UniProtKB/Swiss-Prot annotation, chain B:
Role, per record: Cytosolic calcium-activated calcium channel that mediates the release of Ca(2+) from the sarcoplasmic reticulum into the cytosol and thereby plays a key role in triggering muscle contraction following depolarization of T-tubules. Repeated very high-level exercise increases the open probability of the channel and leads to Ca(2+) leaking into the cytoplasm. Can also mediate the release of Ca(2+) from intracellular stores in neurons, and may thereby promote prolonged Ca(2+) signaling in the brain. Required for normal embryonic development of muscle fibers and skeletal muscle.
Name by which UniProt lists this protein: Ryanodine receptor 1
UniProt domain comment: The calcium release channel activity resides in the C-terminal region while the remaining part of the protein constitutes the 'foot' structure spanning the junctional gap between the sarcoplasmic reticulum (SR) and the T-tubule. Pore opening is mediated via the cytoplasmic calcium-binding domains that mediate a small rotation of the channel-forming transmembrane regions that then leads to channel opening.
Binding partners and assembly: Homotetramer. Can also form heterotetramers with RYR2. Identified in a complex composed of RYR1, PDE4D, PKA, FKBP1A and protein phosphatase 1 (PP1). Repeated very high-level exercise decreases interaction with PDE4D and protein phosphatase 1 (PP1). Interacts with CALM; CALM with bound calcium inhibits the RYR1 channel activity. Interacts with S100A1. Interacts with FKBP1A; this stabilizes the closed conformation of the channel. Interacts with CACNA1S; interaction with CACNA1S is important for activation of the RYR1 channel. Interacts with CACNB1.
Chain positions recorded as Ca(2+) binding sites: E43
Gene name linked to the record: RYR1
Lineage, uppermost ranks: Eukaryota, Metazoa, Chordata, Craniata, Vertebrata
Residues of the full protein shown: 3925 to 3972 of 5037
Tissue expression profile of the protein: Detected in skeletal muscle (at protein level). Fast- or slow-twitch skeletal muscle.
Modifications after synthesis and translation: The N-terminus is blocked.
UniProtKB/Swiss-Prot annotation, chain D:
Species lineage: Eukaryota, Metazoa, Chordata, Craniata, Vertebrata
Localization of this protein: Sarcoplasmic reticulum membrane
MIR domain residues: 71-126, 133-178
Note: Binding of [3H]ryanodine indicates that the heterozygous channel is activated by Ca(2+) concentrations 4-fold lower than normal. Single-cell analysis of cotransfected cells shows a significantly increased resting cytoplasmic Ca(2+) level and a significantly reduced luminal Ca(2+) level.
Signal peptide positions (record): none
Organism: Oryctolagus cuniculus
Tissue: Detected in skeletal muscle (at protein level). Fast- or slow-twitch skeletal muscle.
Name of the protein in question: Ryanodine receptor 1
Post-translation changes: The N-terminus is blocked.
Family statement: Belongs to the ryanodine receptor (TC 1.A.3.1) family. RYR1 subfamily.
Domain note: The calcium release channel activity resides in the C-terminal region while the remaining part of the protein constitutes the 'foot' structure spanning the junctional gap between the sarcoplasmic reticulum (SR) and the T-tubule. Pore opening is mediated via the cytoplasmic calcium-binding domains that mediate a small rotation of the channel-forming transmembrane regions that then leads to channel opening.
Role summary: Cytosolic calcium-activated calcium channel that mediates the release of Ca(2+) from the sarcoplasmic reticulum into the cytosol and thereby plays a key role in triggering muscle contraction following depolarization of T-tubules. Repeated very high-level exercise increases the open probability of the channel and leads to Ca(2+) leaking into the cytoplasm. Can also mediate the release of Ca(2+) from intracellular stores in neurons, and may thereby promote prolonged Ca(2+) signaling in the brain. Required for normal embryonic development of muscle fibers and skeletal muscle.
Domain of life: Eukaryota
Listed result of changing R137C: Decreases threshold for channel activation by K(+), caffeine and 4-chloro-m-cresol. Decreases inhibition by Mg(2+)
Length: 46, 48, 49, 207, 34
């Protein structure tokens, strides 16, 4: 429940008015995959 | 640091034919400061 | 599941559109190759079912 | 003191501490393995399959327009194309996955085709002592990053013995140039040579 | 090792040889041997 408040924050940055930006989506995917703990413990494997 | 930035700015525009008014704005901005540090470096070494 | 659905749709809204895949951009098919290989398909076919 | 273009290097890691030189067989079992080499006092290793030469060194946007289409000292942040010395082919990162645990790790192995999508590797400094725009030294811990798949060549400790993988784990590696530009007319170590005086040969258990 | 020996039992005391010009009672490397 704590980390869900940070994930619904980041939908607002990568998706604006129904069209996805390319610069912010490129830098948030590049940042999330270096840290496996930002995903759930199942996908990090069940 | 300024050499590798204008050189990579050239490699980004190496495939395009013409440059718009946005690119020649930023290139003359970078070349004018590059001349100032060129003038800053020569007066350091113009004295004997 | 509220964390996972916030995790999944975040991975959906950061995906490139169809006109970037239609071009010769090597960046857009790279991101789509990471997210398709990050989360499998048949796991989502079971969850939607 | 500083690395150049056209020097043979050996990629080795640290893991008591034991060095694992990255050696590749070639013409069979193209996926790379590692060799124990701190135990040279009791068993000699095989470094003939570990000689990797740096053929070309470019930058990030310098490779970008070449894929869109003598001795140069390489800097940090640049790309490099390591090519084997016995088998004369490139060390790339193929699309397959032999981990079988959904750890999102591509295995790294050799390729004959000269497509520069996956054959190029970009360096990154280990600490804040060196930044982008400096030159590399002998014995600096470096971080190689793939271009197309964007993973880091690291040592996997998950299952069984120690193996190499391209995944999102940072592991530092040593370049360690095994042979620089040698003058012709003098012997160096690692050279294939004869002992003419007649030749010193064996029979056709041949001891 | 004069026989050739397998790689597993080859040691430093078993196989180590040198090159010299004559036995008297006594960066890159220097170009000594041609």
């Amino acid at each position: 429940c704590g980390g869900e408040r940070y994930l619904d924050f980041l939908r607002f940055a990568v998706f604006v008015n129904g069209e996805s930006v390319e610069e912010n989506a490129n830098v948030v995917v590049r940042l999330l995959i270096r840290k496996p703990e930002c995903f759930g413990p199942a996908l990090r494997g069940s | 640091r300024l050499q590798e930035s204008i050189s990579d700015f050239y490699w980004y525009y190496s495939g395009k034919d013409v440059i718009e008014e946005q690119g020649k704005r930023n290139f003359s901005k970078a070349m004018s400061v590059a001349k100032q540090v060129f003038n800053s470096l020569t007066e350091y070494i113009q004295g004997p | 599941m509220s964390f996972y659905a916030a995790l999944i749709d975040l991975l959906g809204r950061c995906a490139p559109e169809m006109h970037l895949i239609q071009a010769g951009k090597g960046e857009a098919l790279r991101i789509r190759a990471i997210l398709r290989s990050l989360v499998p398909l048949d796991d989502l076919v079971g969850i939607i079912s | 003191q500083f690395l150049r273009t056209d020097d043979e290097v050996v990629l080795q890691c640290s893991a008591e501490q034991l060095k694992l030189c990255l050696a590749a067989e070639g013409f069979g079992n193209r996926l790379c393995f590692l060799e124990p080499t701190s135990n040279a006092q009791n068993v000699p290793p095989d470094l003939a399959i570990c000689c990797f030469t740096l053929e070309q060194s470019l930058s990030v946007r310098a490779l970008q327009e070449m894929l869109a289409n003598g001795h140069r000292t390489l800097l940090y942040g640049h790309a490099i194309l390591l090519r084997h010395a016995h088998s004369r082919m490139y060390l790339s990162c193929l699309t397959t996955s032999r981990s079988m645990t959904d750890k999102l790790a591509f295995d790294v192995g050799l390729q004959e085709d000269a497509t520069g999508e996956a054959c190029w590797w970009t360096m990154h400094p280990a600490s804040k002592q060196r930044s982008e725009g400096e030159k590399v030294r002998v014995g600096d811990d470096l971080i190689l990053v793939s271009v197309s798949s964007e993973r880091y060549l690291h040592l996997s400790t998950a299952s069984g013995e120690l193996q190499v993988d391209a995944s999102f784990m940072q592991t530092l590696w040593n370049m360690n140039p095994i042979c620089s530009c040698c003058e012709e007319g003098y012997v160096t170590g690692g050279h294939v040579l004869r002992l003419f005086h007649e030749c010193l040969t064996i029979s056709a258990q041949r001891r | 090792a004069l026989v050739v020996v397998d790689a597993c039992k080859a040691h430093t005391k078993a196989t180590s040889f040198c090159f010299r010009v004559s036995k008297e009672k006594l960066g890159m490397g220097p170009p000594e041997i041609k």
